[PDB]
C-alpha cells in the first residue's frame, strides 16, 4: 500500500536522469542544420534525431544497473530501443491542440508535413501521430513517463542481447515500481498499467515500420549522406 524506500529511490534517480537530459528550453535546436519547407527537412530532422540519441544514451547511463551491463548489451539495448525512446520522450513536446511537436519557436514546430519532407510516408506517420495522441491522453505523471522509457530501454527481448536474465530482472523491478506507483500515487489509475504496457507494444510496431523506412533512405547515398555519423552507427545494421 506504499512504495518502498528502494522504489522511491529508483523513481528519484529516473526523474533526475530525465531532467538532466531533456531541456525544455530547446535552445540547442538552433545549432541544428536549419529546417526547410526532394527532402527539405531531412538535414534538420537528422540533426534533431542525432542530438536526441545522445540525450537517450545519457539517460540510459543513469538508469540503475544499465551501466553495469556489458558494453555489448548496452549497445544492443540502445541500438534497438533508441527510436522508441525518442518517440516516447517526444511526447513531452507534442500538443493535442496543434497535433504537432512544438519546440520553442515556430521554426521548431514540426507538423506532419514537415516529417513527410524528411522522407516519411503516412504509413509510418499515421500510427506515429495516433500513438502520440493516445499517449498524451494517458496524462502520465512524470514518474510514469520516465518509468516507461526506462522499461522500454531495458527490454530483454531485443536482437542481440546476451545477459538476457539480468536485463529481464532489471526490467521486472521497474515494472513493479511502475505498478506500485500507479496504485498508490495515481488516482483512478487502476486501468493505467495495462494501457502503458500496450504503448510498449505500439512502439515495437512503430519501430518495425520506421526501421523499414530507414533502410530505404540509407540505401540511397544522396540521402544517407545527409545523416549524421551517430545516426548511421545507431540505426545501422552492424553487430
Amino acid at each position: 500500500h506504499m512504495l518502498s524506500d528502494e522504489q522511491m529511490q529508483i523513481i528519484n534517480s529516473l526523474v533526475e536522469a530525465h531532467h538532466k537530459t531533456y531541456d525544455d528550453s530547446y535552445s540547442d535546436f538552433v545549432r541544428f542544420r536549419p529546417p526547410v519547407r526532394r527532402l527539405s527537412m531531412l538535414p534538420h530532422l537528422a540533426d534533431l534525431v542525432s542530438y536526441s540519441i545522445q540525450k537517450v544514451i545519457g539517460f540510459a547511463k543513469m538508469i540503475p544497473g544499465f551501466r553495469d551491463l556489458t558494453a555489448e548489451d548496452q549497445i544492443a539495448l540502445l541500438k534497438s530501443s533508441a527510436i522508441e525512446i525518442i518517440m516516447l520522450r517526444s511526447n513531452q513536446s507534442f500538443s493535442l491542440e496543434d497535433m504537432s511537436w512544438s519546440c520553442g519557436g515556430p521554426d521548431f514546430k514540426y507538423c506532419i508535413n514537415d516529417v513527410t519532407k524528411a522522407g516519411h510516408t503516412l504509413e509510418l506517420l499515421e500510427p506515429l501521430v495516433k500513438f502520440q495522441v493516445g499517449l498524451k491522453k494517458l496524462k502520465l505523471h512524470e514518474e510514469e513517463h520516465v518509468l516507461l522509457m526506462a522499461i522500454c530501454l531495458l527490454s530483454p527481448d531485443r536482437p542481440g542481447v546476451q545477459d538476457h536474465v539480468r536485463i529481464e530482472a532489471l526490467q521486472d523491478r521497474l515494472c513493479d515500481v511502475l505498478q506500485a506507483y500507479i496504485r498508490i500515487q495515481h488516482p483512478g489509475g487502476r486501468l493505467l498499467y495495462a494501457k502503458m504496457i500496450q504503448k510498449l507494444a505500439d512502439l515495437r510496431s512503430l519501430n518495425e515500420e520506421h526501421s523499414k523506412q530507414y533502410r530505404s533512405l540509407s540505401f540511397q547515398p544522396e540521402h544517407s549522406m545527409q545523416l549524421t555519423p551517430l545516426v548511421l552507427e545507431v540505426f545501422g545494421s552492424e553487430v
Binding site: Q54, I57, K61, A71, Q74, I75, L78, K79, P229, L230, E233, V234, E238, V239
Partner: peptide, 10 residues
C-alpha cells in the same frame, strides 16, 4: 565497431 557509441557510453 560502434566507435561513437562506445565513446559516448564512456
Amino acid at each position: 565497431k560502434h566507435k561513437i557509441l562506445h565513446r559516448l557510453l564512456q
